[PDB]
């Protein structure tokens, strides 16, 4: 069969677009099929219509189950299956309240009095309107009331709250909701994230370095900021830094020069930063 002429979108709602088209050429047509495309669609995709089956005598239909505030583009296909029609003009569905809360509400590393809350941003496909934003609600675990913060950036993925009265590693119940111009949306499920844990504050003590071979030296050492690992700097008399195999209390320097005096310092680190250096140890291969 021939292709339809072009799609004319007559009425637009939040999830519904009433559209018509000029009929295709019968070379007896069984049905017309409707497809739409959005910046979030993986190409052209079929749409649900009213009526469920668009018979051959019908030149119009009502596309349903569309997403609010999403740009769309329609085309018709005839089947007795022929070529699709010319794509319609770019329309956009009407605004609606948001129905999708952000996922992966979690925490991040921060400073000693920061509560770093993070979340996966919501794409425009599920913002459902202009003026989209987030509502970050948090409270100490077990308390009643909430502290709420409005994040007006639609692309924002985290928020940092600074409170000098909140001690480090304090658990907080956290919700992250959504809103737009037409009204508020739902909140995410309550998650519990701890605050702060700043940079490691204590330096390693009893740093003992001992020569093992002509090119190897074994080092061993022993708070407020939890250590995620230790970085060890060693110089001869050429600065070189090395790290541990996780949160361990030792390293083995390799590839050193024979019968050579080396100096050494150790310091811990985590996601927030580094700690203070240790006392300078030294041995000779």
């Amino acid at each position: 069969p021939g292709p339809p002429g072009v799609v004319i979108v007559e009425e637009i709602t939040e999830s519904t677009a009433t559209l018509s088209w000029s009929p295709a050429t019968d070379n007896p047509i069984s049905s017309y099929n409707l497809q739409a495309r959005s910046p979030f669609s993986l190409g052209w995709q079929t749409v649900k219509t009213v009526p469920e089956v668009i018979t051959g005598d019908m030149e119009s239909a009502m596309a349903v189950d569309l997403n609010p505030w999403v740009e769309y583009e329609f085309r018709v296909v005839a089947t007795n299956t022929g070529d699709p029609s010319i794509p319609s003009r770019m329309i956009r569905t009407n605004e609606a309240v948001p129905k999708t809360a952000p996922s992966n509400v979690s925490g991040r590393s921060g400073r000693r009095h920061e509560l770093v809350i993070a979340w996966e941003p919501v794409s425009e496909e599920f913002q459902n309107g202009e003026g989209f934003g987030y509502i970050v609600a948090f409270r100490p675990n077990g308390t009643r009331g909430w502290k709420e913060k409005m994040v007006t950036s639609s692309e924002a993925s985290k928020f940092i709250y600074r409170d000098e009265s909140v001690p480090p590693l304090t658990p907080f119940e956290v919700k992250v909701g959504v809103y737009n111009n037409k009204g508020d949306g739902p909140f995410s499920q309550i998650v519990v994230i701890c605050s702060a844990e700043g940079e490691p504050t204590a330096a390693p003590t009893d740093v003992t370095a001992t020569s093992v071979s002509v090119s190897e030296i074994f080092v061993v050492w022993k708070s407020l900021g939890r250590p995620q690992g230790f970085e060890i700097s060693y110089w001869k008399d050429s600065v070189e830094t090395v790290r541990t195999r996780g949160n361990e209390s030792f390293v083995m320097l390799t590839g050193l020069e024979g019968n050579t005096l080396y100096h050494l310092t150790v310091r811990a680190y985590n996601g927030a930063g580094y700690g203070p250096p240790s006392r300078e140890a030294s041995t000779t291969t």
Binding site: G131, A137, R144, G145, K147, K149, Y179
Partner: protein, 131 residues
């Protein structure tokens, strides 16, 4: 940082008089009082040294960060915003208070949103609490 005229000593926590001793009865004064800070805007919130009850102007530093409002239990967190308007702080305070009155509640706390000028904003956040 907030503001003869008197200002808040951010290092001690007390109120000091005008540095030159001449300025009496806003954004430019915030910047001259705190030259080490980047004062970008001002917004409305008892001082002796003879007592006087005044509502000080907060010298907003750097980019605007909306205030974190406290929502006690059994209260509601509400907010209004219009990208096609730009009103004053007194307007949004009255809007927030009248909105709680329409719902037969009281205005417990409020804050400004989306600045659009010197002490003028495009939105408001507030908390209505039951009677």
């Amino acid at each position: 940082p907030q503001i003869l005229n008197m200002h808040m000593n951010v290092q001690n926590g007390k109120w000091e008089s005008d540095p030159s001793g001449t300025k009496t009865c806003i954004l430019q004064y915030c910047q001259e009082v705190y030259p080490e800070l980047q004062i970008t805007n001002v917004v409305e919130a008892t001082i002796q040294n003879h007592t006087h009850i005044v509502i000080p102007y907060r010298c907003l530093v750097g980019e605007f960060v909306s205030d974190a409002l406290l929502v006690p239990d059994k209260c509601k967190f509400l907010h209004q915003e219009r990208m096609d308007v730009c009103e004053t702080h007194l307007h949004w305070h009255t809007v927030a208070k009248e909105t709680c009155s329409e719902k037969s509640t009281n205005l417990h706390d409020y804050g400004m949103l989306l600045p659009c000028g010197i002490d003028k904003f495009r939105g408001v956040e507030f908390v209505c609490c039951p009677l």
